[PDB]
């Protein structure tokens, strides 16, 4: 059967939110906003391989290029809004 990624995606999203908490700390409104976008997304997306791959990619890109972190956050926000319930 299909793999349910609900818990793995919660783990990966919390890992990315932690990176954001560390590196956008002069804008403390960013982390709660991204958290709320995640909480409002459709259940299927939140449990999907699609979201898993999105999250592993954004973590990897953020760690390689800190000078582009807001590009990666803004992209993830847009993805989450596009899958909003």
């Amino acid at each position: 059967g299909k793999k349910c990624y609900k818990l793995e995606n919660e783990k990966l999203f919390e890992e990315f939110l932690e990176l954001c908490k560390m590196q956008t700390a002069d804008h403390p409104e960013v982390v709660p906003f991204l958290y709320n976008r995640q909480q409002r997304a459709h259940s299927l997306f939140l449990a999907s391989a699609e979201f898993c791959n999105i999250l592993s990619r954004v973590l990897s890109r953020a760690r390689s290029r800190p000078a582009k972190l807001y590009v990666y956050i803004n992209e993830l926000c847009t993805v989450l809004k596009a899958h909003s319930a």
Binding site: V30, A67, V71, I73, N74, C77
Partner: peptide, 26 residues
């Protein structure tokens, strides 16, 4: 300081856009 967020032009635009989006959803 060139390590500022606004140094990379794409990052500068993305940051301005995101922070304005957050303000608009207050």
């Amino acid at each position: 300081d060139d390590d500022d967020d606004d140094n990379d032009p794409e990052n500068r635009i993305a940051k301005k856009m995101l922070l304005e989006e957050i303000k608009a959803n207050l």
